[PDB]
């Protein structure tokens, strides 16, 4: 439709953030993705680690 | 050092003009344009080298660039690889008003901007480059 570079940068950075947090929600140095209930999103990486993860 | 680069760039200019003539004849003879594609890798390698930009501008290779970008009389546009490589090279070099005056590439740029068979990304890049080149004239 129309390409203000500032808007493009904002929206593409949002897409990058969503894709990154879909696979890893413990990225140090930035806030986590939160659910509507306030709990952090259980990313795929969190599924595999810990005592209760997939492997253990 | 740099006299030699000018000689090599002039040789490249002659090769590019000869390849364009050969491809135009081949299209007129019922054969596809292949010589431009054959010469494309060497032209790309030369253009990607930044330190040769000054020698390119001193030999006015943009004239041959425009000749390649000029659509052939059969109303057939050049190969998309050639257009993309030439657009990238044009972006990669500091083109000034004097160089445009020497080459007259603005006419072909406007044609690309107005045309519709051209890729929309190339259309946007042509608009951007035309605006950038009009910038120094008005201030």
């Amino acid at each position: 439709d129309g390409s203000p570079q500032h808007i493009i940068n904002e929206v593409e950075q949002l897409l990058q953030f969503h894709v990154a947090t879909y696979m890893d929600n413990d990225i140090a140095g930035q806030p986590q993705a939160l659910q509507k209930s306030g709990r952090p999103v259980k990313a795929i990486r969190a599924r595999l680690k810990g005592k209760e993860g997939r492997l253990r | 050092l740099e006299q030699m680069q000018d000689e090599l760039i002039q040789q490249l200019k002659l090769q590019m003009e000869e390849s364009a003539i050969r491809d135009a004849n081949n299209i007129e003879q019922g054969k596809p344009a292949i010589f431009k594609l054959k010469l494309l890798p060497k032209v790309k390698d030369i253009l990607l080298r930044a330190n040769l930009a000054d020698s390119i501008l001193d030999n006015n290779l943009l004239a041959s660039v425009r000749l390649w970008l000029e659509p052939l009389p059969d109303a057939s546009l050049p190969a998309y690889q050639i257009q993309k490589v030439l657009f990238d090279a044009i972006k990669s070099l500091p083109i000034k008003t004097s160089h445009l005056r020497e080459s007259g590439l603005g006419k072909v740029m406007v044609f690309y901007q107005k045309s519709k068979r051209v890729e929309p990304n190339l259309k946007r890049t042509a608009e951007k480059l035309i605006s950038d080149w009009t910038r120094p004239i008005m201030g």
Binding site: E12, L15, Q16, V19, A20, M23, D24, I27 | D45, L48, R49, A50, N51
Partner: protein, 159 residues
Amino acid sequence: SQFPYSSAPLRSVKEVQFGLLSPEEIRAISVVKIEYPEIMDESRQRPREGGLNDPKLGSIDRNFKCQTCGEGMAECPGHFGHMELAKPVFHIGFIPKIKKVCECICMNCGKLLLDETNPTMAQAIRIRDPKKRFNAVWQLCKTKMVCEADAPVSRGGCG
């Protein structure tokens, strides 16, 4: 004997080969393209085709069979779909490795900053383990901060 008969021969895993998934392979192994954000068609059962709950992806309901393999819930393993991204994005798990690779090569000609002429570089290439090989090559090429369009004769660089 608890599994329904299948004519394919039964064998056991002997090797697990890792690697990344090429976009071509992702498109090839997919069975449907996901494009509509709405999960439900009209909130009247029958989830929207082409959405995140496409029936071709697999079945998790007892009375519904998978539309791709035709097997029941107890037998359908699930089938993948693919989503085309408008602009490429970084994989969050590979950003440090991407940075290292960017440091190891030239950003214009796409070639290594060092060649086998250097005895240390040839020694590093001689090693076998890919991880240690990459570590040594990065330790060497990190120091080299300029691409060479000429041999340190043209080495293929852009200068």
